[PDB]
Amino acid sequence: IEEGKKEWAQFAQEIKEGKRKSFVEHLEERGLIHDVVGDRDLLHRVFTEKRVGIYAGVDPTAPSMHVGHMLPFMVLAWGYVWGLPVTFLLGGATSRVGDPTGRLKGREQVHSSVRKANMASMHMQLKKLGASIERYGEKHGYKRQMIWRRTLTNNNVWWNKTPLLEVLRDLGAYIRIGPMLGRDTVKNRMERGDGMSFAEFTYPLMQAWDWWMLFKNGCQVQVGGSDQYGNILFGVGAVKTISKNTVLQEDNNPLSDDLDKPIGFTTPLLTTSNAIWLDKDMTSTFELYQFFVRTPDDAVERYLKMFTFLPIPEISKIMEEQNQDPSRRVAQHALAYEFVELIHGKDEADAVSMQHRQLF
Amino acid sequence: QRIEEGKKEWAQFAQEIKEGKRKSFVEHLEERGLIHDVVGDRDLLHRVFTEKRVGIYAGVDPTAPSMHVGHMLPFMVLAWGYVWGLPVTFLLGGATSHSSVRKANMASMHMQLKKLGASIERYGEKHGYKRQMIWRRTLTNNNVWWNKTPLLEVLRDLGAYIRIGPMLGRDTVKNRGMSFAEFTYPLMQAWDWWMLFKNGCQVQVGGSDQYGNILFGVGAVKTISKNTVLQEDNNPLSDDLDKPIGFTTPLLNAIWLDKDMTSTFELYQFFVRTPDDAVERYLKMFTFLPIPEISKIMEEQNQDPSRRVAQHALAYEFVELIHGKDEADAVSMQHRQLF
C-alpha cells in the first residue's frame, strides 16, 4: 500500500525526466484519446502525479456488448495492467431512463423481464472480460501485482434507494436549467420537434451522480465514447459542485488543487467503409475473426494500436511487412488473432486463424 | 361495517339531491361563495360529490411560522367538508419547502394546523354539527414519503411521461434563470397528490393562484395512475367520476392566526373594519352561520350599518373559530368597552 505511493512517485520523476511515459502519453501513442474533457496537460499531470481511479459506463440495452463498445474498455484494460484502479460501471438503473445523446426519438419501453435478462447477461460478460484482460495482459508481459485493482459495479446499488430529495438538495439546487437547454442534444430535439421527456432531461444528472458516487472512493477520471463528451463535461462541473456543497463533512471538499478536480476524456469514433457481438453465441469466433481481417489497409495500423496490447515496435515490424504486400493481410491477421484471443481465448484464436487460412 | 353503512347514507343523500330536496357539497359551497374556478367541469364536480364521499385536501408550504387570513378559504372548505362527513386532509409541504429556520417554521405550522383541526371540530359543535364515527380529518407532512421516495420511482411513473416543452411554457417558468430543483417542483406537487389520491383524496382545493398547479396535477395524476407498474395501484380512470379534479377559492401587513403575532384583539379589529359592501359575503365565507341567520343579521345591518352589527358578528365568529369562545367573548367586550 505504502510502497505503491513510493513506486508511483518514482515513476513520476522518471516521466518528467523523459525516461518513462505517463498513462496519457501512453494512450496517445495507442491512439486511444480523441478529446480531453478539460485540459490535456492537466490530465497528463494528474496521471503522472497520482495513481487515480478511472471508470467507464455501459447501459445494458442488449444481452451483449459489441465491438463498438470496446475502446473505452481498452483504456481500462491498459489502466488495469498499469496498476491504476479501474471500474466498470453497469448502468442497470440509468438504462431504464435511456441516454438521449445522439438520438432524436426516444427509446422504446422494453419489458421488465427483458431488461433484467440483458442486465444479467452483460454483468456476466463484463466479469468475463475482466478476467480475460488479466490473462491477455499476462501474455504480453504484464504480471499482476497486489496493488492492481479492477471493479465491476451496478449503479442500481444506489439508484434503487437514492431519494429524489437527496439529489435535488446536493446537486439539483445548484444546476441551472438554462445551460442544460443549450446543449446540442437537447437543442436538436427541440428544434427538430422530436420532443423530450423529463426523465431524459434528468439523465445527465444521473450520470453525474454516478461519477460522484465513484469519485468519493478515488475515481477521479471518467472515460467514454466520442459521443459522451457532453455528459462527461456536465459531469465534471456537477461533481465539483456536489463536493463543494455537500452537507456531509466526511465527503465535503472544495477541490482547490487542480490535481484533485474531476476530469475525463473520450475515445475515437469507429467508422465503416449489423453489430459485431462479443458473445460467442451471437457472433461466432470465426465471424469476429472475419470482421477484423476485413479491416481496410489504411485503418489496420491504427486498429492494431487501439485494439491490442502489441508493442509499438512489433506493430512497426508488422507494418513493414504489410506495406511490402498488403494482399497477404499480415497486419489484419495479427489484429484479428490478438482481439479474438483477448475476447475468446488462445484456443479459439488458434482454431479460427488456422481455419481461415486453410479456407481463404 | 361502518364503511358499508356510510356508503348507504351517502346513497340516500344522492337520491335526495337529484330530487332537489338536498344540496350537494358543491352547491353548498357555491351558496357560501367559496368556489372561484373549477379545474375541470363544475357539473362533474357536482356529480362526483353527489355520488361519492370523496376525499379532499389542501396544501400549505411552511414559509412562515404561522398562516394568516389570506390562507383560510381553502381551509374553510375543508372545515365544511369535515362536518359534512367528507374525509379531509391538510398537507404540510415540509420536504418541498437557513435550515434551522425552516425546521422551526415547519414545527410551528404543524402545531397550528393540529390546533386548527381541533378548533374546526369545536366550532362545528357550536353550530350543531356533531362528530360521527365516519368523520375523518388528517394532517400529513409530505416528508413522510419524500424522505425515502427514490428518484428512479418518480422518473418511471411520472417523469417518463412528462414533456419538458410544455413545462417550459408554463407562465411562471417562461418569464425567467431557474435551478433544476425549482424546475422539478411541479412534479413533486403532482406526486404529493398521487400519494393522497391512492388513499381516496380525489379532490384538491387551493387559493385562486393555484389554478395552474392544480391543472398540472390533474393531468399528472391521470398519467401516473394509468401507467404505474404496480397493478395494485394501476387504474385507467375510465369513469369521469373517478378522475382527479379540483377547484380554487376566491381572491380576497398580514393578519396572522398566531396570537403572539396578531393579538386576538387585532384579529377582531381587522374583521370589524370589513367594508359594508363586503361583510355579507365574508359572513358566508368565513363562518358557519346559517344563511337564514345571516339574512336576519344583514337586514338589521341594513337598518343602520354604522352600528356594524354584521361586522361584529363576523369578527366574533372568526375569532371563536381560531382562538375559542372565551377569547371571542373577551375581545368583543374589550372592543365595546373601548369603542
Ligand SMILES: N[C@@H](Cc1ccc(O)cc1)C(=O)O
Ligand atoms: N451514458 C453512457 C453510459 C454510462 C452510464 C452511466 C455512467 O455513470 C456513465 C456512462 C452511454 O449510454 O454510453
